From a paper:
To determine the molecular mechanism for this interaction and the basis for [name]-mediated GS activation, we created and purified the Mm GS-[name] complex and obtained its crystal structure to 2.3 Å. Strikingly, the structure reveals the Mm GS dodecamer is sandwiched between two [name] trimers. The α1 helices of Mm GS form a crown-like structure around a large central pocket at the top of each hexamer. The [name] trimers slot into each of these hexamer pockets. The [name] trimer core, which is structurally similar to other PII proteins, provides only long-range electrostatic interactions with GS; [name] core residues Arg21 and Lys25 interact with GS residue Glu19. Indeed, almost all the contacts to Mm GS are provided by residues from the [name] T-loops, which extend from the trimer core and insert into the crevices formed between GS subunits. T-loops are typically disordered in apo PII structures, but in the Mm GS-[name] complex T-loop residues 44-52 form a helix that fits snugly into the GS crevices. Each T-loop makes extensive contacts with residues 20–23 and 87–92 from one GS subunit and residues 19–20, 84–87, 171–181 and 220-228 from a second GS subunit. In addition to hydrogen bonds, the GS-[name] interaction includes hydrophobic and van der Waals contacts between [name] T-loop residues Ile48 and Tyr49 and GS residues Ile83, Pro85, His181 and the side chain of Arg87. The interaction with His181 requires the rotation of its side chain and is the only interacting region of GS that undergoes significant structural changes upon [name] binding. The finding from the GS-[name] structure that the [name] T-loops brace together GS hexamer subunits indicates oligomer stabilization as the [name]-mediated activation mechanism.
The enzyme, [name] (GS; EC 6.3.1.2, L-glutamate: ammonia ligase) plays a central role in cellular nitrogen assimilation by incorporating ammonium into glutamine, which serves as a carbon and nitrogen donor for the biosynthesis of nucleotides, amino acids and lipids. Here we describe a structural dissection of the archaeal [name] (Mm) GS and its regulation. Like the Gram-positive GS, the Mm GS active sites are formed at the interface between two subunits in the hexamer and are comprised of five regions; the E flap (Mm residues 303–310), the Y loop (residues 369–377), the N loop (residues 235–247), the Y179 loop (residues 152–161) and the D50 ´ loop (residues 56-71), which is the only active site region contributed from the adjacent subunit. Like other GS dodecamers, the Mm GS dodecamer is formed by two interfaces; hexamer and inter-hexamer interfaces.
Residue numbers in the entry:
A (entry chain A), B (entry chain B): 6 to 447
C (entry chain D): 215 to 447
């Protein structure tokens, strides 16, 4: 394990690492990076690296832009490809302002304050995320398509052509980068796949979500395919979620487990669910962040469009797996892989902590098929829906005292101005569906 | 003029009419028809015509569907094409249930009740509509396209090729059916046109908007072109409205005119504007009936997306033109040519009548550019906007007691259930624009 | 008969095609030949009675009962080809259930509101591929049989039969029309009413020919099977 800069510099000389790539994200989830020649790396440890902070917060506003990244040698990781030139590695850091205080617009910093709030109450958060993607073909120019690589279904042994070898090479690359995958499997849609990661501390796991996406996309490109994390690239088949499994720990023990209760779940696991239900509508804009996210959040598929919890029903917005003991987890099913994982995990934590502190009851479970009910019956059960498009998500989050305080004003207001712009652009587009339905009709 | 059924039977014999077409609309505005041989017509006058009422009200419920159409001779009008087979006419009438009561679900009936309501207070309503449309090319299979016939602009003398003759032939066909056109011109967008109806009695004018649509379409089709009444066929240029000029009359005098006021407008005109503004939000789903309607109701073009009234400003939702005396009129600018004119004018008449009854002051005019203002300025001014998409317009109508009582429950619920279905179909569609924005990004 | 070739020849000579297929296109409506019928005696409409609550005569109900009794047994004649049973599937204008009604427009037998000398019974299941001499004769015999033997039609069905369960309709005793040609053939081969109405020569010829048409179609491997199974198996 690397802990000091001497470890990393020793590892760079020994493994012949020639390139050191930084790894962060902007407010909106986009993965960002610049390349450091391993010759510069010793000065970067000693003095940090000046960079333009508009890489994170965008250019919209006159605000301080001269940020410094301090490298965390414990986050140093060698990437699973070997150019002729020598090896490449990624590394992360903490972003500071020129005055020496931390930049509060860095999404990773927002996760750290959420982590700090939990440790104040004695807990830490573990997450094991389940990531879905499509494996599509490239066209003749090497550019992405939505063309299928198989027609398999849920848990099929598919593909069995050369796409079989490409899928295996993706799993191998992540495994031998130290990810420790639990399992992977073909998902419901044709060409759709899932990878289950091991449970780790939320910070370590969010860092790995960012690495995962560009590692997979690059490996696929170099074998002649494309890996897509679009929430819904195709109509009439399943969309792709990023199911987020979580538990709290204290004193070495799973806070959610209670051997003595009838269901073996503690009262604080119920309060954590109640606080998630109380606030999830207020940050669907964060877990489901693009226009297409709301083409997956429609009835008919895996995706959960109603607010409820359950143990017996596999489909609810929040589900409780049968697992007990230290593997007791809660599973929130609405996020998709477009979400900025630092922000998604941060708000998930704050909501559950607020539930625990304020003793928020989650109500009774919903063990029935909600989509089979009628809107009268769902009203009788107090079953609200998630926001149905990006705009309704924008308006819910814009009013949320909980989201503004958990994110800070900078991130909260940049996120909303950027998303509102995205919505105003889309809501004016005249789509071919409209010409097909209307052109001959009117 | 056609006054008696003997007038129509003589004209049929004298002018060699071999087919009579019925003309009506369904709940949602689609134009409906069946053909009657001239040999069957005298029997048709004597006993009415039985037909299936699913043509108006649809199939979705088990409800009485054997209807009787009683032919109104005074609506007999010969169509402006002469097949070698012989002449063709259209005719309208009144729909009855098998017990002998009028069918309340026919939109034209809905209009006739509104006309009765105003006559109970002394008034009858004139309308002069201004119909915008595009003229497009046909592809090789004679299929509609959105391909342009000119690149002209506002009031240009355009087109000047073979399409100049088609445009003149459209004006000629309507005028010599007896429409009495006032003026036609090229409108702002490429290939866009407008024809200004004669200010006339609302019932007969609504009959004319239906005739106008298929006469124009059929004339253009037979010349190799396509006439499009889509609100917004093309992103980035003007959409097509149906602005609706209207006035009330009592005892043959225009009650919107008062020579002894500074504006030379009576107070009842102001109460009528006041009623229209009070309810326009609640029936935007009727004036703006399809998903495409809300691609036109966006800022930047001729379309009014803000609730206000003005004399000066051409931007207003309600504009009062300079004309005074007998041609004093109020112009409502939001409707598009896909609406059902029977319902759209009826609701307009009922909203304004409710203003005169309740003496609803319209507030102050708005003489500024509303698009140039900030939200707090519009908020300070109390300037509200129209529904931003069809779903919002559905939700607004569904809550409106005023629209329900004016339309009648059968029409009210049928209309909303069908628009709710169209929206649910649209909202799930993954559009090409989403693949362009996200496929390579995510 | 005249109509079909007249319409076809007119359309061909204008550059178009007039098609009388039951179901030329999946996922839209098919084409039927609804057959409205009146019976007359002494100059008067047998089905009209000014004194009954619905103004239908008793023989009208007996006529309906006869049609309901036998219709399953000559679906093979009113719905003659393999493609006919792609129209007789739920979801469209086609009536796939055996029932009568005045209120529901989609019942197998419908009574329009018209009374008087124009009182009529609409039998909705036939399609334009049927021999109309054979269809109209079988409808006439069946109605006549209902009147001679006083066959009650039972209760009308005023609700949506599709929106009921398989048990719900069995609770109502509502039967289906045959699901395919082979099934319609087997219903007709065992019918004495159909055999006597057509005569033995017609009965046997018709059945042997349709049995050959089905034996051909059932062995075809359709492109839908490749799309569903080639990758799968």
């Amino acid at each position: 394990k690397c802990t000091t800069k001497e470890d990393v510099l020793e590892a760079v000389k020994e493994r012949d690492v020639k390139f050191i790539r930084t790894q962060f994200t902007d407010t909106l989830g986009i993965i960002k990076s610049w390349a450091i020649p391993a010759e510069q790396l010793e000065e970067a440890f000693e003095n940090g690296v000046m960079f333009d902070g508009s890489s994170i917060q965008g250019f919209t506003r006159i605000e301080e832009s001269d940020m410094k990244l301090a490298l965390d040698p414990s986050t140093f990781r060698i990437l699973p490809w070997r150019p002729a030139t020598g090896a490449v590695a990624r590394i992360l850091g903490d972003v500071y302002l020129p005055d020496g205080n931390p930049f509060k617009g860095d999404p990773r910093y927002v996760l750290k304050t959420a982590i700090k709030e939990a440790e104040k109450m004695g807990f830490s958060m573990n997450v094991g995320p389940e990531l879905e993607f499509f494996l599509f073909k490239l066209d003749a120019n090497g550019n992405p398509t939505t063309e299928l690589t198989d027609q398999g279904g849920y848990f099929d042994f598919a593909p069995l052509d050369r796409a079989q070898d490409v899928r295996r090479d993706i799993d191998y690359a992540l495994e031998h980068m130290g990810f420790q995958i639990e399992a992977s499997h073909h998902e419901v849609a044709p060409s759709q796949h899932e990878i289950d990661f091991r449970f780790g501390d939320v910070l370590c796991t969010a860092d790995n979500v960012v690495t995962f996406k560009y590692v997979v996309k690059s490996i696929a490109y170099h074998k002649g395919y494309y890996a897509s994390f679009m929430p819904k690239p195709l109509f009439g088949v399943n969309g792709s979620g990023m199911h987020s499994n979580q538990s709290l720990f204290k004193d070495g023990k799973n806070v959610f487990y209670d051997p003595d209760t009838p269901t073996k779940l503690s009262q604080d696991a119920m309060y954590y669910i109640g606080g998630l239900l109380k606030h999830i509508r207020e940050f669907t804009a964060v877990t489901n962040p693009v226009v297409n996210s709301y083409k997956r959040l429609v009835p008919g598929y895996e995706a959960p469009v109603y607010i409820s919890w359950s143990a017996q029903n596999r489909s609810s917005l929040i589900r409780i797996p049968a697992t007990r003991g230290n593997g007791t987890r809660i599973e929130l099913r609405c996020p998709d892989p477009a979400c900025n994982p630092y922000l998604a995990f941060a708000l998930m934590l704050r909501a559950g902590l607020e539930g625990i502190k304020n003793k928020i009851d989650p109500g009774e479970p919903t063990n029935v098929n909600i989509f089979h009910l009628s809107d009268k019956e769902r009203e009788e059960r107090g079953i609200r829906s998630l926001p149905a498009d990006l705009k309704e998500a924008i308006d819910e989050m814009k009013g949320s005292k909980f989201v503004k305080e958990a994110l800070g004003e900078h991130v909260f207001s940049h996120y909303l101005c950027a998303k509102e712009m995205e919505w105003d652009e889309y809501k004016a587009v005249v789509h071919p569906w409209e010409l097909s339905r209307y052109l001959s009709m009117l």
